[PDB]
Design a protein around this ligand. Structure first.
Ligand code: HEM
Ligand code: HEM
Ligand code: HEM
Ligand code: HEM
Lengths: 141, 146, 146, 141
């Protein structure tokens, strides 16, 4: 789980992210649909075109959810309860797609905040997004 | 892996501005600290007790260049990666026995060092171009397993 | 994969007493229930709401035979697995796009059905023989990715 | 994490395992060193010969630890505290070796208790051994 110092880091970036998390939300999503096009399968109902307001809108929601989880960081589970079910019972997203998503967010925070993304913070934000990944898939294991 | 031209351009052109000494060291340093069970394999590098000790360790910082140099070699013969790593397959498979997942981890990490380094110039399609390369290189190491 | 004789013996001989209709169905049923995100891919099989509904579902229980039959085909041309699955590569890679991890999962599960079925006759070296086969078969599906 | 019904299952087998868990402990270990010989690397100090009292002794300890975790199943973390550190700080066992170990235990419980290992219990005992795996590697993430 999260260390007391992990959380220092996790939160820090998210503030150093701030309200910018609308654009990062999309940028990560687009990076997923480009670098990992087999992810496109899950949004057949979307216009998966660059900039498409769908991926932009969906973007905000995604970061916003992370924003919300790194605030209730002592209780990520309950902060993402409603999503855990959707992502496992309706959607059935393969566990491995979560690895990919986190990866692209780290790429996003690196590009925009490289003088913050130090190995120690690299670790923490992985460890965070691993446990964000885990609780969204609780209906598998 | 059927390569695209824009991909080769993207790979070779971003490979252009890469300083392998730093990137390589930083890339390994991040592998050593983020996935600390990888340090098991570099017991011969000595002091890796701390994140601080790892990120200036001459051997890490020296070896890091070695491994990235090797990445470069792929960037040259992109269509012939199978054999560029053929031997370092036996090294990593028969001698060292590293689980191939690590090759992606160290390859996923590489993508992040690249991203922090070249900022907006690292577009999602570039990221994707480099994603394949790294994915190709890890098969080429793995090739001598199954 | 350089095969051993005892391995071919072990694979073909335990393959002997396999009832593919049951094993295959049970194998898929276990894939469907233990890793329930796999059911996404069989939305065309209808009722998979419950463990009970999955484990007698004619389509699961019918498809299960199909897939295991296919395993058999590998057991015949063990040295030529690369091409036995070549096409079902495109099926699973280009059309269906299943992440290759699933091929091990469904292959790890297979090893358990085999184990419950043949009890002490499933010695650790047999288990190991079948471990390679399954590992070989999943590369052969995967082959058309990188 | 573990469901209240997961635990019903988890515990059940372990009783239906019982004191037999000395022999199962070895059988699983041997199945790991055969089916996955790249695991042998971690015990260069051992005689990794079939039946070798080393692998037999080490066997008991391993199951015994699982035995103990499925008893303190509400608090596996603290039940395996002392091992988490050893397996990450001294030993540095690759996370993927844990996947393998669990797999061979399931093979072991299948061979010996197949009319107990029903898909539902297959699930539960995976989910258990996943969280046994997780807390032993807490110093990574
Ligand atoms: C940390 C990881 C993730 C977070 C924080 C996240 C967040 C969200 C949120 C907040 C929603 C609700 C949007 C709505 O109300 O419609 C959602 C929906 C969804 N997510 Fe994710 N998600 C994650 C991972 C994934 C991954 C890996 C996939 C892979 C395909 C995925 C696919 C979807 C889909 C298909 C929807 C439904 C949207 C629709 O069809 O309208 N998510 N996600
Ligand atoms: C993914 C791409 C990787 C590449 C391209 C790569 C490449 C290389 C190269 C070129 C060498 C130097 C051989 C020599 O100097 O003669 C080397 C050595 C080594 N690599 Fe890798 N490697 C990779 C991943 C890994 C991973 C993931 C691990 C361990 C987790 C690993 C462990 C080692 C070790 C232990 C050595 C020997 C260190 C020494 O010489 O003291 N490598 N690698
Ligand atoms: C690991 C070994 C596997 C083998 C040997 C295998 C083999 C096959 C075979 C022989 C077919 C039938 C093709 C036909 O009837 O023309 C098939 C269909 C299919 N397989 Fe696989 N498969 C494997 C794993 C997987 C996995 C892991 C998934 C998904 C998670 C998957 C999803 C499918 C789907 C969706 C179909 C089509 C179902 C249908 O016809 O309605 N398979 N597979
Ligand atoms: C559920 C998984 C596991 C459990 C319950 C478990 C249990 C144990 C226990 C109780 C010990 C202490 C024995 C002692 O006091 O010396 C131990 C030590 C050890 N375990 Fe594990 N273990 C697990 C996974 C692994 C894996 C995957 C490896 C892979 C190589 C491993 C390698 C070792 C080693 C090398 C030792 C030290 C023994 C020695 O050198 O004397 N363990 N384990």
């Amino acid at each position: 789980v999260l260390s007391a110092s992990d959380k220092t880091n996790v939160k820090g970036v998210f503030a150093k992210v701030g309200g910018s998390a609308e654009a990062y939300g999309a940028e990560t999503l687009e990076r997923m649909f480009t670098a990992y096009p087999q992810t496109k399968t899950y949004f057949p109902h979307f216009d998966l075109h660059h900039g498409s307001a769908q991926i932009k809108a969906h973007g905000k929601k995604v970061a916003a959810a992370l924003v919300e989880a790194a605030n209730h960081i002592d209780d990520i589970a309950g902060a993402l309860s409603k999503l855990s079910d959707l992502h496992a019972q309706k959607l059935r997203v393969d566990p491995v797609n979560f690895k990919l998503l986190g990866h692209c967010f780290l790429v996003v925070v690196a590009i925009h905040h490289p003088t913050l993304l130090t190995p120690e913070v690299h670790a923490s934000l992985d460890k965070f997004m691993c446990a964000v990944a885990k609780e969204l898939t609780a209906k598998y294991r | 892996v059927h390569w695209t031209a824009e991909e080769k351009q993207l790979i070779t052109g971003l490979w252009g501005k890469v300083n392998v000494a730093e990137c390589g060291a930083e890339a390994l340093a991040r592998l050593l600290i983020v996935y600390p069970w990888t340090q098991r394999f570099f017991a011969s590098f000595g002091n890796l007790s701390s994140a601080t000790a790892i990120t200036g360790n001459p051997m890490v910082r020296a070896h890091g260049k070695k491994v990235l140099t090797s990445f470069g070699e792929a960037v040259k013969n992109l269509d012939n990666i199978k054999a560029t790593f053929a031997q370092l397959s036996e090294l990593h498979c028969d001698k060292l026995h590293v689980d191939p997942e690590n090759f992606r981890l160290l390859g996923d990490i590489l993508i992040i060092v690249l991203a922090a380094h070249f900022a907006k110039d690292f577009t999602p399609e570039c990221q994707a171009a480099w994603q394949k390369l790294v994915g190709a290189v890890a098969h080429a190491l793995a090739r001598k397993y199954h």
